[PDB]
Scaffold this motif. Structure first.
Motif, mmCIF file in Angstrom:
data_model
loop_
_atom_site.group_PDB
_atom_site.id
_atom_site.type_symbol
_atom_site.label_atom_id
_atom_site.label_comp_id
_atom_site.label_asym_id
_atom_site.label_seq_id
_atom_site.Cartn_x
_atom_site.Cartn_y
_atom_site.Cartn_z
ATOM 1 N N UNK A 60 50.001 42.345 38.975
ATOM 2 C CA UNK A 60 49.054 42.213 40.077
ATOM 3 C C UNK A 60 47.894 41.313 39.682
ATOM 4 N N UNK A 61 47.435 41.436 38.436
ATOM 5 C CA UNK A 61 46.407 40.537 37.931
ATOM 6 C C UNK A 61 46.929 39.110 37.811
ATOM 7 N N UNK A 62 48.212 38.944 37.473
ATOM 8 C CA UNK A 62 48.792 37.606 37.396
ATOM 9 C C UNK A 62 48.837 36.942 38.767
ATOM 10 N N UNK A 63 49.196 37.699 39.807
ATOM 11 C CA UNK A 63 49.081 37.186 41.169
ATOM 12 C C UNK A 63 47.645 36.772 41.472
ATOM 13 N N UNK A 64 46.685 37.631 41.124
ATOM 14 C CA UNK A 64 45.291 37.370 41.463
ATOM 15 C C UNK A 64 44.732 36.166 40.716
ATOM 16 N N UNK A 65 45.253 35.873 39.519
ATOM 17 C CA UNK A 65 44.725 34.754 38.744
ATOM 18 C C UNK A 65 44.945 33.426 39.452
ATOM 19 N N UNK A 66 46.053 33.291 40.183
ATOM 20 C CA UNK A 66 46.361 32.041 40.867
ATOM 21 C C UNK A 66 45.470 31.794 42.076
ATOM 22 N N UNK A 67 44.667 32.776 42.486
ATOM 23 C CA UNK A 67 43.800 32.648 43.642
ATOM 24 C C UNK A 67 44.239 33.421 44.868
ATOM 25 N N UNK A 68 45.363 34.130 44.808
ATOM 26 C CA UNK A 68 45.823 34.920 45.941
ATOM 27 C C UNK A 68 44.981 36.182 46.107
ATOM 28 N N UNK A 69 44.929 36.682 47.341
ATOM 29 C CA UNK A 69 44.207 37.909 47.667
ATOM 30 C C UNK A 69 45.120 39.099 47.397
#
Length: 229
Positions: A60-69
């Motif tokens: 979930x943090x990896x998703x968030x790192x790219x800029x996604x909500x």
């Protein structure tokens, strides 16, 4: 503690699965999902992802790192508080949810819903898994994506027990043992195809290798919501 293990126990057989932080399984999984689904993190306003079982909070943090909500959901308060601390420590913004997948509700919808690292099939009956699928379909925007990361059953040689045990720094123990309904590829397709989804690819690992029923370690299905008039 960098290493954690999953243990699968059937009646006669046993399988151990090794997970190391430095392997970056979460990032490579996210990278594969972004590449195959075509989701652009640079797009504004940023697309929304629901990690319906964040676990420790790595993918979930990896998703968030790219800029996604990113909204992270988990039943364990400890695992959620772990994901808060890591996101707080990296200056990453994330929303957090503590809902059961059978009755999970939101006011908004999502472009991608991710159920990763064998977090599916924990319930008493098969009907409860069809309910969850229908639930996930109702939380998606039109054309939304659902990524389901299941173990490939060949790697275990209908319910197997999956055991995980975590330890805090002081030594406090956290036990995560589940029953897992094991789905063949046909069953996994039938589950999604009759849940409102169209399967777009299947891959055998977090690098995107093609799925071979007889050899692949993983069975990660990437499905897209069918159109509705």
């Amino acid at each position: 503690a960098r290493e954690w293990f999953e243990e699968w126990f059937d009646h006669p057989l046993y399988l151990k699965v090794y997970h190391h932080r430095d392997a970056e399984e979460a990032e490579r999984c996210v990278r594969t999902i972004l590449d195959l689904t075509g989701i652009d993190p640079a797009w504004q306003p940023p697309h929304s992802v629901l990690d319906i079982a964040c676990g420790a909070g790595r993918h979930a943090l990896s998703f968030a790192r790219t800029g996604l909500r990113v909204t992270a959901n988990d039943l364990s308060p400890y695992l959620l508080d772990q994901a808060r601390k890591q996101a707080k420590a990296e200056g990453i913004n994330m929303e957090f949810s503590r809902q059961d997948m059978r009755t999970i509700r939101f006011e908004r919808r999502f472009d991608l819903i991710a159920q990763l690292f064998s977090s599916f099939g924990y319930f008493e009956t098969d009907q409860e898994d069809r309910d969850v699928i229908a639930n996930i379909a109702s939380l998606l925007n039109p054309g939304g994506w659902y990524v389901l990361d299941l173990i490939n059953p060949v790697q275990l040689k209908r319910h197997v027990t999956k055991k995980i045990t975590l330890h805090e720094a002081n030594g406090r123990k956290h036990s995560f043992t589940e029953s897992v309904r094991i789905y063949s590829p046909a069953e996994a397709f039938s589950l999604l195809e009759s849940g409102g989804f169209a399967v777009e690819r299947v891959v055998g690992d977090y690098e995107g290798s093609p799925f071979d029923e007889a050899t692949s370690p993983r069975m990660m299905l990437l499905a897209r919501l069918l159109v509705s008039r």
